[PDB]
Point group: C2
Chain length 90, copies 2
C-alpha cells in the first residue's frame, strides 16, 4: 500500500515523465517542453512569470535542459507559494 | 478547477497540517507530532532512520519545531528516492 504522500509524489514524477519523454534525451526537459508544462500543469500565478524566465531560473548548469533535480526546484517554489497564498491577506 | 500539480501540492500541504493541527501553533509540528506523522504517512525506508534523527535534521532554525518549509526537505528526499525507484528494473 502507498501512503498519501507517496501517491502525491508519484503524480508529480508522472508529470515530469510526460514531458521528458517527448524528445531527445528522455531524462531531460527542453525549453519548448517546459513552456508546454507550465501553461498546462501550472496555475496563473506561476505561469504569468514567463516560460523563458522560469527556464533561465531552473537551468542551473546552463546545459540547455531541465533535468529532474532541477524540476524539483519548481516544485518546491510552487509549494512555498501555494502555502503562502493560503494564509495571505490583502 | 485544479491541475494535477496543484492537486499534488495541496495534498502534500494537507498531510503536514493534518499533524500541525494537533496542538500548539498550527504552523508547527512538535517532536512527538513528527514521530506520529513518520510512522503513519511515510514508507519503511523513511521511518527506519529514526524519529529523533529526522527531527534534529529537519529543525533547521533549532526552535524546537518543524515548520512547513523545513518539512519540504523530507518531501524532496522522498521524491528523489521515488524517482530513482520508478526507473529501476525487477
Ligand atoms: Ca526529453
Ligand atoms: Ca540543466
Ligand atoms: Ca501544531
Ligand atoms: Ca524549526
Amino acid at each position: 500500500m502507498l501512503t498519501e504522500l507517496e501517491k502525491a509524489l508519484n503524480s508529480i514524477i508522472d508529470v515530469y515523465h510526460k514531458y521528458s519523454l517527448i524528445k531527445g534525451n528522455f531524462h531531460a526537459v527542453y525549453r519548448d517542453d517546459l513552456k508546454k508544462l507550465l501553461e498546462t500543469e501550472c496555475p496563473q500565478y506561476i505561469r504569468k512569470k514567463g516560460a523563458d524566465v522560469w527556464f533561465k531560473e531552473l537551468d542551473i548548469n546552463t546545459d540547455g535542459a531541465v533535468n529532474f533535480q532541477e524540476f524539483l526546484i519548481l516544485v518546491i517554489k510552487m509549494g512555498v507559494a501555494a502555502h503562502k497564498k493560503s494564509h495571505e491577506e490583502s
